[PDB]
Design a protein around this ligand. Structure first.
Ligand SMILES: [Zn+2]
Length: 186
């Protein structure tokens, strides 16, 4: 056998709505699932790739449980999909990718490759890569990143995030970043 397993984690779900648009009352949880579904479908078409997702529907899953699911799936890579939010603002734009604090396992490399590839596909503002102690990253056992796919709190970004062709481009960019990582550092 020679397959890589990619665990996709659409952030939030169920009772946890994540960020909520002030314009339109759209929820991050729903947009995360839309983007993740496109990413999952694209990865599953690749030859040596098996996809595992934390959720396929509007289900609540705790942070602890997501890391447990990822770990039990023996994934090679974890990609969590979230949207960013400004607590006191509605102007920020762009995409950034997080990895666990002081990662030595290749998470930092995965983050940079995915981030740079995304920037080439959607041509959004490059906010770079960031260390973050988010529990899903911290407690997962394999290279793990969380992509903040634009600011749902910024009306311009929301108009992109909701758009299917934009979601498709973003998902394609993520796929190519993951494959480029896996091709070189499985
Ligand atoms: Zn989130």
């Amino acid at each position: 056998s020679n397959a890589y397993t990619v665990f996709i984690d659409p952030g939030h779900g169920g009772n946890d709505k994540g960020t909520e648009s002030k314009t339109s009352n759209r929820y991050e949880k729903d947009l995360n699932l839309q983007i993740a579904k496109k990413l999952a479908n694209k990865l599953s078409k690749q030859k040596d790739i098996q996809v595992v997702v934390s959720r396929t529907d509007d289900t609540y899953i705790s942070l602890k449980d997501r890391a447990i699911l990822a770990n039990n799936s023996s994934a090679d890579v974890l990609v969590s999909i979230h949207l960013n939010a400004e607590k006191n603002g509605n102007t920020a734009t762009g995409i950034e990718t997080w990895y666990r604090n002081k990662a030595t396992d290749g998470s930092k490399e995965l983050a940079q490759t995915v981030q740079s590839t995304i920037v080439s596909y959607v041509k959004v503002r490059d906010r770079g890569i960031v260390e973050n102690n988010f529990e899903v990253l911290r407690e997962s056992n394999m290279p793990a990143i969380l992509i903040e796919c634009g600011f749902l709190t910024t009306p311009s970004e929301e108009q992109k995030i909701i758009n299917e062709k934009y979601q498709d481009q973003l998902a394609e960019g993520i796929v190519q970043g993951v494959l480029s990582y896996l091709d070189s550092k499985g």
